[PDB]
Design a protein around this motif. Structure first.
Motif, PDB file in Angstrom:
ATOM      1  N   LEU A 191       0.802  -1.208   0.000  1.00 37.97           N
ATOM      2  CA  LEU A 191       0.000   0.000   0.000  1.00 37.97           C
ATOM      3  C   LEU A 191       0.829   1.249   0.000  1.00 37.97           C
ATOM      4  O   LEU A 191       0.571   2.215  -0.684  1.00 37.97           O
ATOM      5  N   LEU A 192       1.828   1.286   0.856  1.00 35.21           N
ATOM      6  CA  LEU A 192       2.649   2.430   0.975  1.00 35.21           C
ATOM      7  C   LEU A 192       3.268   2.811  -0.379  1.00 35.21           C
ATOM      8  O   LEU A 192       3.431   3.979  -0.698  1.00 35.21           O
ATOM      9  N   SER A 193       3.571   1.793  -1.164  1.00 36.00           N
ATOM     10  CA  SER A 193       4.243   1.948  -2.488  1.00 36.00           C
ATOM     11  C   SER A 193       3.462   2.748  -3.461  1.00 36.00           C
ATOM     12  O   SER A 193       4.033   3.325  -4.382  1.00 36.00           O
ATOM     13  N   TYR A 194       2.169   2.894  -3.239  1.00 33.77           N
ATOM     14  CA  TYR A 194       1.364   3.781  -4.094  1.00 33.77           C
ATOM     15  C   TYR A 194       1.615   5.256  -3.847  1.00 33.77           C
ATOM     16  O   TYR A 194       1.123   6.114  -4.610  1.00 33.77           O
ATOM     17  N   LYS A 228      13.035   2.018  -4.533  1.00 38.35           N
ATOM     18  CA  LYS A 228      13.423   1.025  -3.531  1.00 38.35           C
ATOM     19  C   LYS A 228      13.682   1.774  -2.199  1.00 38.35           C
ATOM     20  O   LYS A 228      14.801   2.185  -1.906  1.00 38.35           O
ATOM     21  N   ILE A 229      12.612   2.035  -1.480  1.00 37.62           N
ATOM     22  CA  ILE A 229      12.642   2.835  -0.267  1.00 37.62           C
ATOM     23  C   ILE A 229      12.603   1.941   0.943  1.00 37.62           C
ATOM     24  O   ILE A 229      11.722   1.137   1.116  1.00 37.62           O
ATOM     25  N   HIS A 230      13.510   2.158   1.873  1.00 37.20           N
ATOM     26  CA  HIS A 230      13.502   1.343   3.057  1.00 37.20           C
ATOM     27  C   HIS A 230      12.338   1.908   3.912  1.00 37.20           C
ATOM     28  O   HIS A 230      12.203   3.086   4.049  1.00 37.20           O
ATOM     29  N   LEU A 231      11.545   1.033   4.413  1.00 35.68           N
ATOM     30  CA  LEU A 231      10.375   1.481   5.224  1.00 35.68           C
ATOM     31  C   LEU A 231      10.681   1.334   6.693  1.00 35.68           C
ATOM     32  O   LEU A 231      10.456   2.253   7.467  1.00 35.68           O
ATOM     33  N   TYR A 235      11.140  -3.131   2.488  1.00 39.13           N
ATOM     34  CA  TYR A 235      11.181  -2.154   1.495  1.00 39.13           C
ATOM     35  C   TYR A 235       9.828  -2.057   0.746  1.00 39.13           C
ATOM     36  O   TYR A 235       9.119  -2.994   0.785  1.00 39.13           O
ATOM     37  N   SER A 236       9.666  -0.957   0.077  1.00 40.19           N
ATOM     38  CA  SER A 236       8.573  -0.657  -0.802  1.00 40.19           C
ATOM     39  C   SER A 236       8.749  -1.529  -2.026  1.00 40.19           C
ATOM     40  O   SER A 236       9.806  -2.025  -2.301  1.00 40.19           O
ATOM     41  N   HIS A 237       7.695  -1.687  -2.779  1.00 42.04           N
ATOM     42  CA  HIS A 237       7.721  -2.407  -4.059  1.00 42.04           C
ATOM     43  C   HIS A 237       8.069  -1.512  -5.234  1.00 42.04           C
ATOM     44  O   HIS A 237       7.569  -0.415  -5.321  1.00 42.04           O
ATOM     45  N   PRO A 238       8.901  -1.984  -6.138  1.00 45.78           N
ATOM     46  CA  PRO A 238       9.234  -1.281  -7.357  1.00 45.78           C
ATOM     47  C   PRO A 238       8.115  -1.239  -8.400  1.00 45.78           C
ATOM     48  O   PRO A 238       8.195  -0.467  -9.303  1.00 45.78           O
ATOM     49  N   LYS A 239       7.096  -2.024  -8.237  1.00 38.56           N
ATOM     50  CA  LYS A 239       5.963  -2.021  -9.172  1.00 38.56           C
ATOM     51  C   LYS A 239       4.685  -2.275  -8.420  1.00 38.56           C
ATOM     52  O   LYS A 239       4.642  -3.157  -7.593  1.00 38.56           O
ATOM     53  N   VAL A 240       3.676  -1.446  -8.684  1.00 37.45           N
ATOM     54  CA  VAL A 240       2.359  -1.697  -8.137  1.00 37.45           C
ATOM     55  C   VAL A 240       1.349  -1.916  -9.302  1.00 37.45           C
ATOM     56  O   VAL A 240       1.644  -1.519 -10.462  1.00 37.45           O
ATOM     57  N   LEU A 241       0.173  -2.395  -8.980  1.00 38.56           N
ATOM     58  CA  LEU A 241      -0.835  -2.588 -10.015  1.00 38.56           C
ATOM     59  C   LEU A 241      -1.715  -1.306  -9.952  1.00 38.56           C
ATOM     60  O   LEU A 241      -2.378  -1.026  -8.930  1.00 38.56           O
ATOM     61  N   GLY A 242      -1.844  -0.681 -11.087  1.00 41.54           N
ATOM     62  CA  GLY A 242      -2.695   0.509 -11.123  1.00 41.54           C
ATOM     63  C   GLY A 242      -1.809   1.709 -10.899  1.00 41.54           C
ATOM     64  O   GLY A 242      -0.613   1.546 -10.692  1.00 41.54           O
ATOM     65  N   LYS A 243      -2.360   2.905 -11.055  1.00 46.76           N
ATOM     66  CA  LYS A 243      -1.564   4.136 -11.030  1.00 46.76           C
ATOM     67  C   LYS A 243      -1.206   4.540  -9.621  1.00 46.76           C
ATOM     68  O   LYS A 243      -2.055   4.661  -8.750  1.00 46.76           O
ATOM     69  N   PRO A 244       0.073   4.669  -9.327  1.00 48.93           N
ATOM     70  CA  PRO A 244       0.446   5.153  -7.999  1.00 48.93           C
ATOM     71  C   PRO A 244      -0.022   6.597  -7.874  1.00 48.93           C
ATOM     72  O   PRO A 244      -0.197   7.329  -8.873  1.00 48.93           O
ATOM     73  N   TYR A 245      -0.352   6.987  -6.658  1.00 48.32           N
ATOM     74  CA  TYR A 245      -0.766   8.339  -6.404  1.00 48.32           C
ATOM     75  C   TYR A 245       0.477   9.209  -6.526  1.00 48.32           C
ATOM     76  O   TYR A 245       0.381  10.348  -6.731  1.00 48.32           O
ATOM     77  N   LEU A 262       4.219   4.930   9.468  1.00 46.53           N
ATOM     78  CA  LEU A 262       5.151   4.910   8.334  1.00 46.53           C
ATOM     79  C   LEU A 262       4.988   6.053   7.382  1.00 46.53           C
ATOM     80  O   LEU A 262       5.996   6.726   6.953  1.00 46.53           O
ATOM     81  N   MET A 263       3.747   6.470   7.141  1.00 47.33           N
ATOM     82  CA  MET A 263       3.517   7.640   6.322  1.00 47.33           C
ATOM     83  C   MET A 263       4.065   8.838   7.015  1.00 47.33           C
ATOM     84  O   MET A 263       4.575   9.757   6.351  1.00 47.33           O
ATOM     85  N   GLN A 264       3.976   8.833   8.346  1.00 48.53           N
ATOM     86  CA  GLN A 264       4.559   9.962   9.096  1.00 48.53           C
ATOM     87  C   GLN A 264       6.072   9.946   9.150  1.00 48.53           C
ATOM     88  O   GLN A 264       6.717  10.947   8.966  1.00 48.53           O
ATOM     89  N   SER A 265       6.674   8.788   9.404  1.00 48.20           N
ATOM     90  CA  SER A 265       8.085   8.642   9.534  1.00 48.20           C
ATOM     91  C   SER A 265       8.845   8.929   8.207  1.00 48.20           C
ATOM     92  O   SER A 265      10.027   9.365   8.165  1.00 48.20           O
ATOM     93  N   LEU A 266       8.144   8.656   7.111  1.00 44.27           N
ATOM     94  CA  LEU A 266       8.679   8.934   5.790  1.00 44.27           C
ATOM     95  C   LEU A 266       8.439  10.361   5.329  1.00 44.27           C
ATOM     96  O   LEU A 266       8.901  10.815   4.251  1.00 44.27           O
ATOM     97  N   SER A 267       7.835  11.136   6.192  1.00 43.07           N
ATOM     98  CA  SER A 267       7.467  12.495   5.867  1.00 43.07           C
ATOM     99  C   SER A 267       6.605  12.528   4.608  1.00 43.07           C
ATOM    100  O   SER A 267       6.623  13.477   3.859  1.00 43.07           O
ATOM    101  N   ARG A 268       5.768  11.515   4.408  1.00 43.03           N
ATOM    102  CA  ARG A 268       4.950  11.502   3.216  1.00 43.03           C
ATOM    103  C   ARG A 268       3.636  12.180   3.480  1.00 43.03           C
ATOM    104  O   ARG A 268       3.030  12.776   2.577  1.00 43.03           O
ATOM    105  N   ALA A 269       3.013  11.945   4.661  1.00 39.18           N
ATOM    106  CA  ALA A 269       1.795  12.590   4.959  1.00 39.18           C
ATOM    107  C   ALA A 269       1.755  13.266   6.336  1.00 39.18           C
ATOM    108  O   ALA A 269       2.540  12.952   7.208  1.00 39.18           O
TER     109      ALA A 269
END
Length: 302
Positions: free
Chosen positions: A161-164, A171-174, A189-199, A223-230
Protein backbone atom coordinates in the motif's frame (compact mmCIF):
# COMPACT_ATOMS: atom_id res chain seq x y z
CA UNK A 1 8.48 -15.57 50.05
CA UNK A 2 8.38 -18.41 47.51
CA UNK A 3 5.70 -16.73 45.33
CA UNK A 4 8.05 -13.82 44.64
CA UNK A 5 10.96 -16.04 43.64
CA UNK A 6 8.55 -18.17 41.62
CA UNK A 7 7.62 -15.17 39.48
CA UNK A 8 11.10 -13.77 39.44
CA UNK A 9 12.67 -16.93 38.16
CA UNK A 10 10.17 -17.34 35.35
CA UNK A 11 10.45 -13.60 34.45
CA UNK A 12 14.16 -13.65 34.04
CA UNK A 13 13.93 -16.71 31.88
CA UNK A 14 11.17 -15.23 29.76
CA UNK A 15 13.12 -11.94 29.30
CA UNK A 16 16.42 -13.64 28.41
CA UNK A 17 14.84 -15.64 25.65
CA UNK A 18 12.16 -13.27 24.28
CA UNK A 19 12.60 -9.56 25.10
CA UNK A 20 13.28 -7.67 21.87
CA UNK A 21 16.06 -5.58 23.44
CA UNK A 22 18.59 -8.43 24.12
CA UNK A 23 21.24 -5.91 24.91
CA UNK A 24 19.36 -5.04 28.04
CA UNK A 25 19.30 -8.56 29.45
CA UNK A 26 22.73 -8.51 31.20
CA UNK A 27 21.81 -5.46 33.23
CA UNK A 28 18.31 -6.70 34.00
CA UNK A 29 19.78 -10.01 35.24
CA UNK A 30 22.02 -7.97 37.60
CA UNK A 31 19.35 -5.68 38.97
CA UNK A 32 16.26 -7.85 39.27
CA UNK A 33 17.70 -10.33 41.81
CA UNK A 34 19.10 -7.42 43.76
CA UNK A 35 15.83 -5.69 44.55
CA UNK A 36 14.38 -5.63 48.02
CA UNK A 37 11.34 -8.01 47.95
CA UNK A 38 10.55 -8.32 51.56
CA UNK A 39 7.80 -5.75 51.32
CA UNK A 40 5.62 -7.46 48.64
CA UNK A 41 3.14 -10.22 49.32
CA UNK A 42 0.39 -10.09 46.74
CA UNK A 43 0.34 -10.48 42.97
CA UNK A 44 -0.72 -6.92 42.71
CA UNK A 45 2.29 -5.76 44.69
CA UNK A 46 4.60 -8.02 42.73
CA UNK A 47 3.33 -6.72 39.43
CA UNK A 48 3.59 -3.11 40.58
CA UNK A 49 7.02 -3.49 42.02
CA UNK A 50 8.49 -5.34 39.04
CA UNK A 51 6.69 -2.95 36.65
CA UNK A 52 8.31 0.10 38.34
CA UNK A 53 11.68 -1.52 38.28
CA UNK A 54 11.35 -2.72 34.73
CA UNK A 55 10.32 0.74 33.44
CA UNK A 56 13.20 2.34 35.33
CA UNK A 57 15.60 0.03 33.75
CA UNK A 58 14.11 -0.24 30.24
CA UNK A 59 11.86 2.70 29.54
CA UNK A 60 9.85 0.30 27.47
CA UNK A 61 6.14 0.50 28.17
CA UNK A 62 5.47 -2.62 26.04
CA UNK A 63 7.03 -4.87 28.71
CA UNK A 64 4.51 -5.15 31.44
CA UNK A 65 3.29 -7.50 34.12
CA UNK A 66 -0.40 -7.62 34.41
CA UNK A 67 -3.23 -9.77 35.85
CA UNK A 68 -3.96 -12.62 33.38
CA UNK A 69 -7.38 -11.06 33.23
CA UNK A 70 -6.10 -8.04 31.25
CA UNK A 71 -4.30 -10.17 28.63
CA UNK A 72 -5.55 -8.95 25.23
CA UNK A 73 -8.88 -9.79 23.70
CA UNK A 74 -8.61 -11.53 20.31
CA UNK A 75 -7.00 -11.04 16.90
CA UNK A 76 -9.00 -9.03 14.37
CA UNK A 77 -11.10 -10.74 11.73
CA UNK A 78 -10.74 -9.22 8.31
CA UNK A 79 -11.55 -10.54 4.82
CA UNK A 80 -9.93 -14.01 4.51
CA UNK A 81 -8.43 -15.37 1.30
CA UNK A 82 -10.42 -18.56 1.73
CA UNK A 83 -13.61 -16.48 1.53
CA UNK A 84 -12.89 -14.32 -1.52
CA UNK A 85 -15.43 -14.72 -4.41
CA UNK A 86 -14.32 -16.02 -7.81
CA UNK A 87 -16.76 -14.13 -9.95
CA UNK A 88 -15.38 -10.81 -11.24
CA UNK A 89 -18.72 -8.93 -10.79
CA UNK A 90 -18.82 -9.96 -7.13
CA UNK A 91 -15.15 -9.12 -6.54
CA UNK A 92 -15.65 -5.56 -7.98
CA UNK A 93 -18.80 -5.25 -5.87
CA UNK A 94 -16.87 -6.30 -2.70
CA UNK A 95 -14.00 -3.92 -3.45
CA UNK A 96 -16.66 -1.18 -3.96
CA UNK A 97 -17.92 -1.65 -0.44
CA UNK A 98 -14.51 -2.12 1.24
CA UNK A 99 -13.15 1.19 -0.13
CA UNK A 100 -15.20 4.41 -0.06
CA UNK A 101 -13.84 6.96 -2.45
CA UNK A 102 -15.20 10.57 -2.91
CA UNK A 103 -13.95 13.56 -4.72
CA UNK A 104 -14.60 16.40 -2.25
CA UNK A 105 -15.12 20.01 -3.40
CA UNK A 106 -11.93 21.69 -4.26
CA UNK A 107 -10.69 18.52 -5.96
CA UNK A 108 -9.57 16.82 -2.71
CA UNK A 109 -9.67 13.01 -2.82
CA UNK A 110 -11.29 11.17 0.07
CA UNK A 111 -10.39 7.46 0.66
CA UNK A 112 -11.85 5.47 3.48
CA UNK A 113 -11.37 1.81 4.35
CA UNK A 114 -11.74 0.18 7.76
CA UNK A 115 -9.54 -2.93 7.73
CA UNK A 116 -6.18 -4.13 6.30
CA UNK A 117 -6.50 -7.59 4.75
CA UNK A 118 -3.59 -9.97 4.33
CA UNK A 119 -1.46 -9.43 1.24
CA UNK A 120 -2.87 -12.73 -0.17
CA UNK A 121 -6.29 -11.11 -0.25
CA UNK A 122 -5.09 -7.86 -1.67
CA UNK A 123 -3.46 -9.81 -4.46
CA UNK A 124 -6.84 -11.16 -5.66
CA UNK A 125 -8.57 -7.75 -5.18
CA UNK A 126 -5.84 -5.63 -6.79
CA UNK A 127 -7.31 -5.50 -10.32
CA UNK A 128 -10.60 -4.17 -8.92
CA UNK A 129 -8.91 -1.77 -6.52
CA UNK A 130 -7.55 -0.12 -9.60
CA UNK A 131 -11.06 0.87 -10.64
CA UNK A 132 -12.36 1.81 -7.16
CA UNK A 133 -9.41 3.70 -5.75
CA UNK A 134 -6.34 4.36 -7.84
CA UNK A 135 -7.99 5.60 -11.05
CA UNK A 136 -10.69 7.83 -9.57
CA UNK A 137 -8.22 9.81 -7.26
CA UNK A 138 -5.80 10.46 -10.09
CA UNK A 139 -7.52 13.73 -10.91
CA UNK A 140 -7.07 15.13 -7.32
CA UNK A 141 -4.25 17.33 -6.08
CA UNK A 142 -4.51 16.26 -2.42
CA UNK A 143 -5.74 13.06 -0.73
CA UNK A 144 -7.30 12.43 2.66
CA UNK A 145 -7.00 8.85 3.85
CA UNK A 146 -9.54 8.28 6.59
CA UNK A 147 -8.41 5.57 9.09
CA UNK A 148 -10.49 6.72 11.98
CA UNK A 149 -12.58 3.56 11.74
CA UNK A 150 -9.78 1.24 10.72
CA UNK A 151 -9.11 -1.43 13.26
CA UNK A 152 -6.33 -2.83 11.12
CA UNK A 153 -5.54 -6.54 10.70
CA UNK A 154 -2.47 -8.19 9.22
CA UNK A 155 0.42 -5.88 8.28
CA UNK A 156 1.46 -8.05 5.31
CA UNK A 157 0.05 -5.59 2.73
CA UNK A 158 1.36 -2.43 4.34
CA UNK A 159 4.49 -2.18 2.23
CA UNK A 160 2.49 -2.67 -0.95
CA UNK A 161 0.00 0.00 0.00
CA UNK A 162 2.65 2.43 0.97
CA UNK A 163 4.24 1.95 -2.49
CA UNK A 164 1.36 3.78 -4.09
CA UNK A 165 2.62 6.95 -2.43
CA UNK A 166 6.32 6.68 -3.31
CA UNK A 167 8.51 6.81 -6.49
CA UNK A 168 7.94 3.94 -8.95
CA UNK A 169 11.67 3.53 -9.18
CA UNK A 170 13.32 4.12 -5.81
CA UNK A 171 13.42 1.02 -3.53
CA UNK A 172 12.64 2.83 -0.27
CA UNK A 173 13.50 1.34 3.06
CA UNK A 174 10.37 1.48 5.22
CA UNK A 175 11.46 -0.11 8.48
CA UNK A 176 13.42 -2.99 9.83
CA UNK A 177 12.08 -5.67 12.09
CA UNK A 178 14.24 -7.27 14.73
CA UNK A 179 12.52 -10.42 15.97
CA UNK A 180 14.37 -11.53 19.15
CA UNK A 181 12.72 -14.93 19.21
CA UNK A 182 14.93 -15.51 16.18
CA UNK A 183 17.30 -13.26 14.31
CA UNK A 184 14.93 -11.46 11.95
CA UNK A 185 16.70 -8.15 11.31
CA UNK A 186 14.54 -8.14 8.18
CA UNK A 187 14.64 -4.95 6.23
CA UNK A 188 11.29 -4.02 4.70
CA UNK A 189 11.18 -2.15 1.50
CA UNK A 190 8.57 -0.66 -0.80
CA UNK A 191 7.72 -2.41 -4.06
CA UNK A 192 9.23 -1.28 -7.36
CA UNK A 193 5.96 -2.02 -9.17
CA UNK A 194 2.36 -1.70 -8.14
CA UNK A 195 -0.83 -2.59 -10.01
CA UNK A 196 -2.69 0.51 -11.12
CA UNK A 197 -1.56 4.14 -11.03
CA UNK A 198 0.45 5.15 -8.00
CA UNK A 199 -0.77 8.34 -6.40
CA UNK A 200 2.86 9.36 -6.46
CA UNK A 201 5.13 11.17 -3.96
CA UNK A 202 4.25 14.77 -4.72
CA UNK A 203 0.61 15.39 -3.98
CA UNK A 204 -0.50 16.20 -0.47
CA UNK A 205 -1.60 13.33 1.70
CA UNK A 206 -3.49 13.64 4.99
CA UNK A 207 -4.19 10.60 7.23
CA UNK A 208 -7.01 10.79 9.72
CA UNK A 209 -6.70 8.82 12.94
CA UNK A 210 -8.73 7.96 16.04
CA UNK A 211 -8.22 6.11 19.30
CA UNK A 212 -9.83 3.14 17.56
CA UNK A 213 -7.18 3.00 14.76
CA UNK A 214 -5.28 -0.26 15.33
CA UNK A 215 -2.52 -2.64 14.30
CA UNK A 216 -1.78 -2.51 10.58
CA UNK A 217 -3.58 0.87 10.34
CA UNK A 218 -1.28 2.35 12.98
CA UNK A 219 1.76 0.97 11.15
CA UNK A 220 0.55 2.55 7.92
CA UNK A 221 -0.10 5.89 9.56
CA UNK A 222 3.21 5.75 11.49
CA UNK A 223 5.15 4.91 8.33
CA UNK A 224 3.52 7.64 6.32
CA UNK A 225 4.56 9.96 9.10
CA UNK A 226 8.08 8.64 9.53
CA UNK A 227 8.68 8.93 5.79
CA UNK A 228 7.47 12.50 5.87
CA UNK A 229 4.95 11.50 3.22
CA UNK A 230 1.80 12.59 4.96
CA UNK A 231 0.46 14.73 7.76
CA UNK A 232 -1.30 12.70 10.45
CA UNK A 233 -4.47 14.31 11.92
CA UNK A 234 -6.71 13.22 14.74
CA UNK A 235 -6.38 11.31 17.99
CA UNK A 236 -3.49 9.29 19.40
CA UNK A 237 -4.15 5.74 18.20
CA UNK A 238 -5.02 2.60 20.14
CA UNK A 239 -1.47 1.37 20.73
CA UNK A 240 -2.26 -2.15 19.69
CA UNK A 241 0.57 -3.44 17.52
CA UNK A 242 1.44 -7.10 16.88
CA UNK A 243 4.97 -6.81 18.32
CA UNK A 244 4.56 -8.65 21.66
CA UNK A 245 3.57 -12.01 23.13
CA UNK A 246 2.03 -12.83 26.43
CA UNK A 247 3.64 -15.28 28.91
CA UNK A 248 1.65 -16.54 31.86
CA UNK A 249 3.34 -17.10 35.14
CA UNK A 250 2.60 -20.70 36.08
CA UNK A 251 0.79 -21.06 39.39
CA UNK A 252 -0.35 -17.48 39.49
CA UNK A 253 -3.01 -15.07 38.35
CA UNK A 254 -0.25 -12.97 36.63
CA UNK A 255 1.25 -12.76 33.26
CA UNK A 256 3.87 -10.81 31.40
CA UNK A 257 3.58 -9.14 27.97
CA UNK A 258 6.85 -8.98 26.29
CA UNK A 259 7.80 -7.18 23.12
CA UNK A 260 9.54 -9.75 20.94
CA UNK A 261 10.00 -7.45 18.02
CA UNK A 262 11.63 -4.10 17.60
CA UNK A 263 10.46 -1.81 14.87
CA UNK A 264 13.16 0.51 13.55
CA UNK A 265 11.96 3.11 11.10
CA UNK A 266 13.73 4.62 8.19
CA UNK A 267 15.19 7.40 10.45
CA UNK A 268 16.59 4.77 12.78
CA UNK A 269 14.08 5.46 15.52
CA UNK A 270 12.75 2.50 17.52
CA UNK A 271 8.98 2.72 17.75
CA UNK A 272 7.72 1.56 21.08
CA UNK A 273 4.06 1.76 19.96
CA UNK A 274 1.58 2.80 22.54
CA UNK A 275 -0.10 4.88 19.75
CA UNK A 276 0.81 6.99 16.73
CA UNK A 277 0.94 10.62 17.81
CA UNK A 278 -0.64 12.86 15.15
CA UNK A 279 1.07 15.95 13.79
CA UNK A 280 -2.28 17.78 14.33
CA UNK A 281 -3.98 16.51 17.43
CA UNK A 282 -7.76 16.98 17.41
CA UNK A 283 -10.72 14.92 18.50
CA UNK A 284 -11.71 12.33 15.80
CA UNK A 285 -14.86 14.25 14.79
CA UNK A 286 -12.76 17.29 13.93
CA UNK A 287 -10.11 15.60 11.82
CA UNK A 288 -11.69 15.97 8.42
CA UNK A 289 -12.33 19.67 9.04
CA UNK A 290 -8.77 20.09 10.11
CA UNK A 291 -7.36 18.44 7.13
CA UNK A 292 -9.43 20.71 4.87
CA UNK A 293 -8.13 23.72 6.81
CA UNK A 294 -4.58 22.62 6.35
CA UNK A 295 -5.14 22.11 2.70
CA UNK A 296 -6.86 25.53 2.25
CA UNK A 297 -4.10 27.49 3.99
CA UNK A 298 -1.12 25.65 2.43
CA UNK A 299 1.50 28.20 1.25
CA UNK A 300 1.13 28.81 -2.48
CA UNK A 301 4.94 28.20 -2.47
CA UNK A 302 6.12 31.74 -3.13
Amino acid sequence: DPSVTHVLHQLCDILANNYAFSERIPTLLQHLPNLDYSTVISEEDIAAKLNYELQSLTEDPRLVLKSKTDTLVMPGDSIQAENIPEDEAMLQALVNTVFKVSILPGNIGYLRFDQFADVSVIAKLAPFIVNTVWEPITITENLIIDLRYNVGGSSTAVPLLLSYFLDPETKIHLFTLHNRQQNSTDEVYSHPKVLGKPYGSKKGVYVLTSHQTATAAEEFAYLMQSLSRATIIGEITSGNLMHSKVFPFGDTQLSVTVPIINFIDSNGDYWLGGGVVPDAIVLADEALDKAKEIIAFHPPLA
